[PDB]
Design an enzyme around this catalytic site. Structure first.
Site, PDB file in Angstrom:
ATOM      1  N   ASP A  14       1.932 -11.949   8.710  1.00 46.21           N
ATOM      2  CA  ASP A  14       1.882 -11.874   7.001  1.00 46.21           C
ATOM      3  C   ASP A  14       0.509 -12.301   6.281  1.00 46.21           C
ATOM      4  OD1 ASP A  14       2.157 -14.664   6.844  1.00 46.21           O
ATOM      5  OD2 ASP A  14       4.097 -14.474   6.377  1.00 46.21           O
TER       6      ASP A  14
ATOM      7  N   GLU B  27       9.327  -6.870   1.386  1.00 47.84           N
ATOM      8  CA  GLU B  27       8.897  -7.317   2.857  1.00 47.84           C
ATOM      9  C   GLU B  27       8.182  -6.271   3.507  1.00 47.84           C
ATOM     10  OE1 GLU B  27       9.182 -10.629   3.820  1.00 47.84           O
ATOM     11  OE2 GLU B  27      10.613 -11.229   2.651  1.00 47.84           O
TER      12      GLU B  27
ATOM     13  N   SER C 161      12.932 -25.477 -12.652  1.00 47.54           N
ATOM     14  CA  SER C 161      13.140 -23.900 -12.822  1.00 47.54           C
ATOM     15  C   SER C 161      14.720 -23.601 -12.497  1.00 47.54           C
ATOM     16  CB  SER C 161      12.194 -23.352 -11.808  1.00 47.54           C
ATOM     17  OG  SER C 161      10.934 -23.146 -12.349  1.00 47.54           O
TER      18      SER C 161
ATOM     19  N   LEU D 153      10.720 -14.016   9.871  1.00 48.83           N
ATOM     20  CA  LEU D 153       9.686 -14.840  10.295  1.00 48.83           C
ATOM     21  C   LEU D 153      10.075 -15.398  11.557  1.00 48.83           C
ATOM     22  CD1 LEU D 153       7.225 -16.839   9.600  1.00 48.83           C
ATOM     23  CD2 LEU D 153       9.020 -18.369   8.749  1.00 48.83           C
TER      24      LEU D 153
ATOM     25  N   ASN E 198       7.638 -21.155 -16.248  1.00 46.73           N
ATOM     26  CA  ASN E 198       7.687 -22.288 -15.029  1.00 46.73           C
ATOM     27  C   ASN E 198       7.524 -21.874 -13.793  1.00 46.73           C
ATOM     28  OD1 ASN E 198       9.342 -24.734 -13.609  1.00 46.73           O
ATOM     29  ND2 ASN E 198       7.576 -25.365 -15.095  1.00 46.73           N
TER      30      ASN E 198
ATOM     31  N   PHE F 157      15.653 -16.122   0.843  1.00 49.63           N
ATOM     32  CA  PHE F 157      15.497 -15.379   2.237  1.00 49.63           C
ATOM     33  C   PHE F 157      13.844 -15.653   2.569  1.00 49.63           C
ATOM     34  CE2 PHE F 157      16.041 -11.462   4.474  1.00 49.63           C
ATOM     35  CZ  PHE F 157      14.756 -11.071   4.865  1.00 49.63           C
TER      36      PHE F 157
END
Lengths: 164, 164
Positions: free
Chosen positions: B20, B11, B117, B32, B132, B104
């Site tokens: 971003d 990040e 997945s 965010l 995948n 996150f």
């Protein structure tokens, strides 16, 4: 009649976010949330103003508290401003309400820019001030309220708000 | 290495609002603010998140507090979700960090949608899960971090974060 009753008439009351006639997000009794076109900005500003996650809806008492704060902010703005204070100090109680009404709507900086109209009101040239105010951008932005506010300055009576 | 060091790498740290690579307003360590295109929305959300008028700038300790809250929110979201919890519970400590990293970033709902997945990770089919995951929209939205997170799931080591 007084400033509170005057503004209730000019602003109306809503408990949910709405857009005014100029497109700005507003709530309560004329509480401007933002001039941003963003509803999300408005929703966040509401939460900030109230102190909780409102989900865009406020209570009657919350509306009254914002209105009390907003009228006081307008009076505070008049009292701190060198162009507004002398005018305010010179006016009778009815005409002071018309001045607070304008500052509540447009802010201290905005109303302080009405240089010639302010001078005319201080000189008590009521008719000439009314003619001059009707030439301003304000007069076409919010014509219904502007005509009533101007009648108030012209006459020093509550004639424009009778029975409303 | 652990989830905190992993996310600091993925990040980065900024103390002022920035956009971003997908255009979203972000601050701190991957916090965010909003997906709205409105900077004013972002500025208000920041003030809400921090509890003061920040003027778009936060402190180092404020960034750490948001990061602590955001990692805990991701773990809380995993633990409440019927598709995420069984997977989380089955994984070793290193692979649990890769899962928290994904939540996150994308949120509980988003990661819970990776049905196949998730199943492969629970079955410990590491290579097939890595193949995948590389087919997902996530892999192209944030490719640098996705490759490292996938290496972590594939190998169960910190190889992808060594020396970073």
């Amino acid at each position: 009649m007084n400033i509170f009753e005057m503004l209730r008439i000019d602003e109306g009351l809503r408990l949910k976010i709405y857009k005014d006639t100029e497109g700005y997000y507003t709530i309560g009794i004329g509480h401007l949330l933002t001039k941003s076109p963003s509803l999300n900005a408005a929703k966040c500003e509401l939460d900030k103003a109230i102190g909780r996650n409102t989900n865009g809806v406020i209570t009657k008492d919350e509306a009254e508290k914002l209105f009390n704060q907003d009228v006081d902010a307008a009076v505070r703005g008049i009292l701190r401003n060198a162009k507004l204070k002398p005018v305010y100090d010179s006016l009778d109680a009815v005409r002071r309400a018309a001045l607070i009404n304008m500052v509540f709507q447009m802010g201290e900086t905005g109303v302080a820019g009405f240089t010639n109209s302010l001078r005319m009101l201080q000189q008590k040239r009521w008719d000439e001030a009314a003619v001059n105010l009707a030439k301003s951008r304000w007069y076409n932005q919010t014509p219904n309220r502007a005509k009533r506010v101007i009648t108030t300055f012209r006459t020093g009576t509550w004639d424009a708000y009778k029975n409303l």
